[PDB]
Amino acid sequence: KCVNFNFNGLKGTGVLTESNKKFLPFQQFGRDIADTTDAVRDPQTLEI
Amino acid sequence: SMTKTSVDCTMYICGDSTECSNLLLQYGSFCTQLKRALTGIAVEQDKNT
Numbered sequence: 001k002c003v004n005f006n007f008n009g010l011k012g013t014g015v016l017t018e019s020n021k022k023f024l025p026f027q028q029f030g031r032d033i034a035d036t037t038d039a040v041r042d043p044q045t046l047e048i
Numbered sequence: 049s050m051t052k053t054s055v056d057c058t059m060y061i062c063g064d065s066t067e068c069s070n071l072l073l074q075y076g077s078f079c080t081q082l083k084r085a086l087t088g089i090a091v092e093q094d095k096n097t
Contacts, residue, residue: 012064036063
């Protein structure tokens with residue numbers, strides 16, 4: 001769903017799709033080729 | 049010819065922000081000159097074919 005975001009101060013607009021790639025357990029978020037945020041895990045939950 | 053492209057200033061300059069587009073009106077009419085230049089590139093590359 002095309003919604004707004006608020007993930008510990010990180011804001012954006014997009015939809016939610018599950019990530020098939022592996023992730024670090026101590027990682028908060030990752031970056032794309034253009035160095036903006038692309039995959040944010042739930043603090044309260046945890047699904048990358 | 050070449051691969052035709054077009055750049056919109058709403059998404060390239062501003063990364064999903066409403067207040068960035070409000071301060072874009074203070075810079076005037078810069079982006080309609082670049083839109084007309086990218087259109088006339090695309091007409092001339094269609095004229096080359």
